[PDB]
Amino acid sequence: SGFRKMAFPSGKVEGCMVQVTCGTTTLNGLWLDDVVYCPRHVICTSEDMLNPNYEDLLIRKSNHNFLVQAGNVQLRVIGHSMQNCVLKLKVDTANPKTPKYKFVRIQPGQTFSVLACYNGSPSGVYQCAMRPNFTIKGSFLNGSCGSVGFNIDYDCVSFCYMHHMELPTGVHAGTDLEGNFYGPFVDRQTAQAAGTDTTITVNVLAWLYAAVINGDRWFLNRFTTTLNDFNLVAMKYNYEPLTQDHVDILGPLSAQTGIAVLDMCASLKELLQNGMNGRTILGSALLEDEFTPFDVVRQCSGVT
Amino acid sequence: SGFRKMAFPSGKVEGCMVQVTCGTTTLNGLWLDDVVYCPRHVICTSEDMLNPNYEDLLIRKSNHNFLVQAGNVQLRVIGHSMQNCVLKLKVDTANPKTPKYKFVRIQPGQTFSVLACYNGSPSGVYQCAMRPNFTIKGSFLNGSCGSVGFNIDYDCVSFCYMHHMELPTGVHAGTDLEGNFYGPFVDRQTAQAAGTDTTITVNVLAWLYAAVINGDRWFLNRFTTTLNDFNLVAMKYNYEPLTQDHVDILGPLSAQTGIAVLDMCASLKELLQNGMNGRTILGSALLEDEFTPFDVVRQCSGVT
Numbered sequence: 376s377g378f379r380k381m382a383f384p385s386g387k388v389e390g391c392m393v394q395v396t397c398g399t400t401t402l403n404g405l406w407l408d409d410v411v412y413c414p415r416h417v418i419c420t421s422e423d424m425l426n427p428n429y430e431d432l433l434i435r436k437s438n439h440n441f442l443v444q445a446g447n448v449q450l451r452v453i454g455h456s457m458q459n460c461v462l463k464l465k466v467d468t469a470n471p472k473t474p475k476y477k478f479v480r481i482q483p484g485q486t487f488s489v490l491a492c493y494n495g496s497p498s499g500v501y502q503c504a505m506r507p508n509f510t511i512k513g514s515f516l517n518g519s520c521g522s523v524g525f526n527i528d529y530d531c532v533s534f535c536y537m538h539h540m541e542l543p544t545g546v547h548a549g550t551d552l553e554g555n556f557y558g559p560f561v562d563r564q565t566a567q568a569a570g571t572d573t574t575i576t577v578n579v580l581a582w583l584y585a586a587v588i589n590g591d592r593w594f595l596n597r598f599t600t601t602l603n604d605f606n607l608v609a610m611k612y613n614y615e616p617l618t619q620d621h622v623d624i625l626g627p628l629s630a631q632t633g634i635a636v637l638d639m640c641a642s643l644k645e646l647l648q649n650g651m652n653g654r655t656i657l658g659s660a661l662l663e664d665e666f667t668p669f670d671v672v673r674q675c676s677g678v679t
Numbered sequence: 680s681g682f683r684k685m686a687f688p689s690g691k692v693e694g695c696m697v698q699v700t701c702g703t704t705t706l707n708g709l710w711l712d713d714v715v716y717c718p719r720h721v722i723c724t725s726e727d728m729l730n731p732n733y734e735d736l737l738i739r740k741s742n743h744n745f746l747v748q749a750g751n752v753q754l755r756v757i758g759h760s761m762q763n764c765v766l767k768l769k770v771d772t773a774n775p776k777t778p779k780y781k782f783v784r785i786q787p788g789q790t791f792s793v794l795a796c797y798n799g800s801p802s803g804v805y806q807c808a809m810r811p812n813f814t815i816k817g818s819f820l821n822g823s824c825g826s827v828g829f830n831i832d833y834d835c836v837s838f839c840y841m842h843h844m845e846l847p848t849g850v851h852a853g854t855d856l857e858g859n860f861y862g863p864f865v866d867r868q869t870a871q872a873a874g875t876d877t878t879i880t881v882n883v884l885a886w887l888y889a890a891v892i893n894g895d896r897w898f899l900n901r902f903t904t905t906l907n908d909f910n911l912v913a914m915k916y917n918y919e920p921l922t923q924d925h926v927d928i929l930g931p932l933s934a935q936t937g938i939a940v941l942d943m944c945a946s947l948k949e950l951l952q953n954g955m956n957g958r959t960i961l962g963s964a965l966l967e968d969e970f971t972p973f974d975v976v977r978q979c980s981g982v983t
């Protein structure tokens with residue numbers, strides 16, 4: 376019993392973290408097989424960061440200008456190329472710690488573990504959601520860039536996120552491992568407002584199922600609702616509209632708990648309309664939206 | 680910027696996790712040098728678990744009855760002994776992944792990372808506090824026992840916690856790595872009520888400093904207070920009394936932010952007396968007490 380914002384075990388990712396230095400700027404790289412993936416803003420200087428001409432900047436850089444250090448051993452860089460907003464540095468050595476891995480572009484609402492890194496060294500790990508507005512609410516300083524998000528299916532590490540920039544609002548933006556930004560963000564030093572952030576309704580419901588499973592049930596009411604009723608309430612409170620897809624994905628939690636999805640929606644509806652009246656659910660005084668139905672099933676059954 | 684309930688990178692601990700099986704019961708072991716540390720209730724059967732005579736039970740067990748498996752290779756067990764509530768299984772092979780480590784008994788209020796494990800396999804990692812009543816609010820199922828808590832100072836893993844039992848209230852109890860329970864708990868199948876849990880006041884203050892640093896400051900007021908005034912308010916609300924020690928430890932956050940500790944106490948006082956009025960601090964609708972002043976400094980500066 377008990378329920379925690381649990382991150383994936385970070386060991387398989389630790390073994391892939393390197394330091395990347397170009398001119399003066401240092402940040403993190405991801406060493407998989409004989410390629411190191413890092414943010415392309417590694418090649419920038421403070422005078423460039425306004426509106427960097429990454430193509431013109433990269434012309435001026437040679438394999439020898441990319442200092443790649445794994446612990447206390449340097450990697451020889453035999454190739455460099457720019458794919459969208461990441462650099463691929465071909466090195467002469469395969470990372471002997473390369474886990475089974477894929478590159479996956481996650482969907483907003485989907486969760487992942489971040490291993491925050493500085494100078495290619497891990498500092499810690501936490502679980503995150505891709506916000507509906509394609510931002511993450513991270514813990515990232517100068518030198519945390521190139522830290523990656525991931526999921527792990529048994530032995531396969533799915534890399535979904537590379538950290539690039541912090542918005543003036545203090546929220547985080549980043550790319551997939553093909554260096555495509557999640558959201559409209561560009562790697563520049565300009566004000567870039569994040570759209571309206573909605574609450575990930577299906578994740579709140581999944582978390583309400585986790586609560587019931589772990590014995591927090593005071594919020595179960597004698598009401599039901601309809602997708603269309605519930606969604607009128609969702610709109611008001613900037614929740615994502617609930618679809619039959621979302622309901623289908625909650626089926627395992629519905630089946631286990633025997634609480635129909637639309638009944639739980641009616642619990643959610645009442646919590647939105649009346650607040651929590653100074654009570655808590657799984658040690659939280661607000662509605663947690665960063666556990667997927669998958670996350671709840673995994674943790675509540677103990678998948679490894 | 681941003682602030683997260685961050686766990687230590689779990690890789691150094693993953694490499695120490697094994698499976699321990701005695702009779703039918705399976706749970707987790709910790710393989711360091713040529714010793715495997717596991718909960719002694721591994722030797723119990725469901726008929727024993729009421730009031731187990733661990734000494735008499737252990738008589739009946741031989742080195743060959745302790746099946747110790749690291750991934751898909753068995754360890755030969757050349758010795759077994761009981762220290763308090765853990766078993767030390769001497770194996771013929773040193774764990775080649777043994778990190779630098781110590782065994783440290785933590786103080787209540789101190790935090791640590793848990794790597795929850797099943798069948799010697801990691802499932803995930805989260806940050807925890809030893810509650811003032813020597814319980815932890817974990818995420819642990821059947822087979823999670825022998826999962827360990829830890830801190831990491833650069834390269835040294837300090838093991839502080841081994842998970843043993845869940846109380847009927849669904850809160851967790853466990854030992855240091857010398858198998859001494861934190862708190863009054865015994866490894867039996869009896870109702871064992873946990874004392875009153877207080878809020879770890881110094882950690883809330885440290886978290887209030889983290890909030891101010893990350894730009895959440897709406898709770899800063901024009902008031903101050905005194906240790907003795909503040910502590911009258913602490914009592915009412917079951918906060919731990921604040922001491923000069925606690926104030927001394929907040930000095931780095933006070934100095935950085937230039938907000939005297941007793942001023943922040945006066946912020947805390949008002950939050951206790953008036954609640955949060957439906958606002959949030961670092962994405963929380965209640966007062967977080969599971970970040971130490973050390974934790975806040977580490978994360979806000981980015982120690983690795």
Ligand SMILES: O=C(CC1CCCCC1)Nc1cccnc1
Nearest residue numbers: 416515516517540541562563564
């Ligand atoms: O965002 C920047 C600088 C950006 C990076 C992209 C190019 C313009 C400059 N640094 C940073 C700081 C804290 C957390 N994350 C990232």
Ligand SMILES: O=C(CC1CCCCC1)Nc1cccnc1
Nearest residue numbers: 720819820821844845866867868
């Ligand atoms: O607590 C028990 C059984 C206790 C263990 C000690 C001896 C009496 C039996 N199992 C469990 C379940 C979930 C999380 N943690 C532990």
